[PDB]
Amino acid sequence: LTTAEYLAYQTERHVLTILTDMSSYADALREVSAAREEVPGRRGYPGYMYTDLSTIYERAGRVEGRNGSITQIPILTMPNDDITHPIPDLTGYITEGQIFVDRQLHNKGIYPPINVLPSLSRLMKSAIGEGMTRKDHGDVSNQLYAKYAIGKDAAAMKAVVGEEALSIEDKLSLEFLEKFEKTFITQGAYEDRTVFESLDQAWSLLRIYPKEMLNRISPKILDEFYD
């Protein structure tokens, strides 16, 4: 944190921080707190842990008058596959948005299993748009998420009455879900795709659906994109 701070306020340069296994650091901080022989809190954790995380995640941000910006993206493993853990609850209300992981997709022999449903960002509104990424970013993002969700609901429905009861938008969402899962979601370990390539792949995957199949898209954008 001090290293990132020295390259920001002083050196004035763009910095990025990444922390691995914050749970191990939580157990470490638990041992450090137990070193003072203090009475532990719920589930054997310090009550000041909230402030401890508040003294960590607050090291990220943009400074007024400074070109160099520092961004931090911590990572923590949920114990016993439970989001009810104190750590996740601590980073939840503190940090803006959270990136989860689906064990099913990870057990499906695919690329990184980040569930689109659970995945969210509060500052995502400022990271897109014309001049930032693209004007087709947010709309196609929400449309893809809706396609995955409705595709999941249709997947549950098709597992009930069968595929003979599949409706128009239902089948479209099914194909879109299967495609996005086998194409869009799957990238690779060393694979790095550009934002332009991501948007292009998104439009290409959404091309399977008709023009009226997307109610989350604007007319001007759709007219200035589809070709």
Binding site: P40, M157, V160, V161
Partner: protein, 125 residues
């Protein structure tokens, strides 16, 4: 009785009962629409069979279609009964199973929190 594992099993059963409730609801809707269309078709087949009731051959190609319509009618009735059973299951998954699971989860959570509070109090002492 009040264990975290039991709470997990109860919560999982609750979520599964919720998804099953949604599925049974959608299935009840589809069955309702199907039974409705089959009902209109039953009325149309009733008027059609009532058109000519009370000669030459080829009558075997007449009563056959009426028999098919009758089969569709019986299937529609069975669909109505099945829709009733589905609605009953949905009603049982609404104020019965959900409330019981919620109350049980609440009581278990209270017991676990109280026990943890007692243990923490003993440790503090």
């Amino acid at each position: 009785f009040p264990t975290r594992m039991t709470l997990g099993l109860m919560k999982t059963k609750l979520k599964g009962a919720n998804q099953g409730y949604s599925l049974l609801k959608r299935k009840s809707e589809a069955l309702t629409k199907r039974f409705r269309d089959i009902t209109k078709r039953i009325d149309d087949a009733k008027q059609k069979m009532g058109r000519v009731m009370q000669a030459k051959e080829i009558y075997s190609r007449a009563v056959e279609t009426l028999v098919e319509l009758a089969s569709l009618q019986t299937a529609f009735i069975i669909l109505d009964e099945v829709i009733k059973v589905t609605n009953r299951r949905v009603n049982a998954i609404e104020h019965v199973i959900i409330p019981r699971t919620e109350n049980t989860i609440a009581y278990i959570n209270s017991e676990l929190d109280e026990l943890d509070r007692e243990e923490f109090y003993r440790l503090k002492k």
